[PDB]
């Protein structure tokens, strides 16, 4: 096991993501550039009037029933270690409204957990075979955010002339993209897998610009240490992909192969 | 002296920002909402495409000649401690381009200061004569980021119709400038009171984009500053133009230009 990088992200996240291969001769990947939060190429007119926020008037570190945030959530999903609670619909998820600068709350409240980042040990290794994948080092408990999907967001029209489609993840009234071919977070090495342990969750913090859903993912059980970590990449991938090769995913209940 | 607040940015910025009153009954101040980063009402469009940013190749921490992020800010004007260094222009600042997230350098190099954020240990509090002023808790020495300059980024032809207009600051012509407005919305040096001989210096800075119609502005120390003292910046003649007919400066400085 060669240690290729000792971290892929450059000091951007909060702890290192280095990048091993123990499988064969392949450098760390360089073909695209690492960002830790979501960029735009051709404008996106993301609306950022703070008057159009709505927000909560909470006393409080928003664990009552009456922060507008929670209800604008359906409720606060979080616990008070930023986990989901065992009520949360991985089947379905809901959209989770975080709070925001326009709060009357405290940066610490308990409503605010993937606005504050990437916590996970992660490495990104080379698989047998599926080209690069990201593992956990440590144990991630069920309903922990590992990590938000990152990368260039494009319009629809922009994606339909984009030709490596590999590493987008659909927003989809006006509909939108994030490509992570050429800018994107680790999240761009994650592998499919037809029984995941990440589920993505649609998230408003700063903005909430409905067009624009950040994308954090949760795990959907205790996630052991040293375990690959895989999302459903869908439908409309494996429409056109399952066209090229079919999913090497292995698990018993693979709707792929 | 009473403590009115342990923090007027409710824990947003890196340590906290207490309010103390140790002159009269007014409670900490409400009639405007913190922000620790600047915000917009009406759209600014201000350039985001990653594309565009001017960006390093450095293989080091960016302290050598050869960053080009220095390059364009002239040299690289902090040192190792993250302070101008003693050759800085204090009467006429160059811009100053940090690095980015498009730069080859990892996120601890040398010329990164201001997008690290506030540190200094500092106070809102009741002064005896000009309302509320902020001080430094804690001496502070020669050519420290202090505090960014926070509000709402408005256009010329909205600030002319602003009637408040106590809480501005003017960026830099282009045919086209810009505004920010501290007073609906506002960081804690929306309280920074004038003062002729200023312990603080406005620079115009770029972190994540480089869109020269909106700078952000960066508060550096012109001298020492010792704990206790109250922090000031020249609001400029535009400001006493306007006010001058109101009221005068209440600086005290023995050179006051606006008494
Ligand atoms: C030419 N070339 C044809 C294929 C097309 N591929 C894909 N398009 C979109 N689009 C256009 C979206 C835009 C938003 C609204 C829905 C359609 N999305 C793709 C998503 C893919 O994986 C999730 C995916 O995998 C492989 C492929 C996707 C890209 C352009
Ligand atoms: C009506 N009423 C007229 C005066 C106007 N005041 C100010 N305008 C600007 N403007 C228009 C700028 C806009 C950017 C381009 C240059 C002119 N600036 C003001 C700045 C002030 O303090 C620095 C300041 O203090 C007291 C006052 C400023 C507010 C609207
Ligand atoms: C977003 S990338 C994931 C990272 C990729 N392995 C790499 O090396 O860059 C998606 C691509 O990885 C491969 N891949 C991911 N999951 C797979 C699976 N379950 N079975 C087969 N190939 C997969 C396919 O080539 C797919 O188009
Ligand atoms: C940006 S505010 C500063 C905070 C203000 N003291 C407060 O209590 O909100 C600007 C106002 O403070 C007062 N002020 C600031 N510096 C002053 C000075 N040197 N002399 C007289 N008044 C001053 C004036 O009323 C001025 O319009
Ligand atoms: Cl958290
Ligand atoms: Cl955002
Ligand atoms: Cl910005
Ligand atoms: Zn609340
Ligand atoms: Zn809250
Ligand atoms: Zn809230
Ligand atoms: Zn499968
Ligand atoms: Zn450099
Ligand atoms: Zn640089
Ligand atoms: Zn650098
Ligand atoms: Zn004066």
Same mark, same amino acid.
């Given at each position: ?15 290192? !993501? @280095? ?14 550039? =690492?960002?830790? %939060?979501?960029? +735009? ?8 009037? $703070?008057?159009?926020?709505? =927000?909560?008037?909470? $006393? ?9 945030? #929670? ?6 999903? =979080? ?37 504050? #980042?990437?916590?996970?040990? &992660? %490495? ?15 144990? !991630? @408990? @069920? ?10 967001? !494009? ?11 590999? =590493? &987008? ?5 006006? +509909?939108?993209? $994030? ?43 205790? $996630?052991?240490?040293?375990? %690959? &970590? ?19 995913? #292995?698990? @018993? ?5």
């Amino acid at each position: 096991e060669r240690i290729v990088s000792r971290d892929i992200a450059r000091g951007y996240e909060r702890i290192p !993501i @280095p990048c091993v291969n123990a499988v064969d001769s392949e450098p760390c990947p360089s073909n695209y550039k =690492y960002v830790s %939060q979501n960029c +735009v190429t051709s404008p996106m007119n993301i609306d950022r009037n $703070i008057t159009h926020l709505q =927000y909560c008037v909470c $006393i409080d570190d928003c664990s009552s029933s009456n922060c507008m945030c #929670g209800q604008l959530s359906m409720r606060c999903w =979080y616990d008070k270690d930023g986990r989901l609670l065992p009520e949360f619909n991985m089947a379905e998820p809901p959209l989770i409204f975080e709070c925001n600068h326009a709060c009357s709350c405290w940066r610490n409240c308990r409503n605010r957990v993937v606005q504050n #980042g990437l916590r996970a040990r &992660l %490495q990104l290794y080379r698989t047998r075979d599926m080209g690069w994948g990201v593992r956990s080092l440590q144990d !991630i @408990p @069920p309903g922990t955010f590992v990590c938000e999907y990152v990368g260039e967001l !494009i319009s629809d029209s922009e994606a339909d002339v984009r030709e490596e489609d590999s =590493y &987008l993840f659909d927003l989809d009234g006006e +509909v939108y993209c $994030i490509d992570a071919r050429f800018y994107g977070n680790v999240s761009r090495f994650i592998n499919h897998h037809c029984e995941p342990n990440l589920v993505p969750v649609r998230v408003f913090m700063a903005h909430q610009d409905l067009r624009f859903p950040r994308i954090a993912f949760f795990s959907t059980r205790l $996630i052991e240490a040293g375990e %690959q &970590l895989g999302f459903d990449y869908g439908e409309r991938f494996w429409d056109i992909k399952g066209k090229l090769f079919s999913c090497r995913c #292995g698990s @018993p209940k693979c709707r792929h192969s």
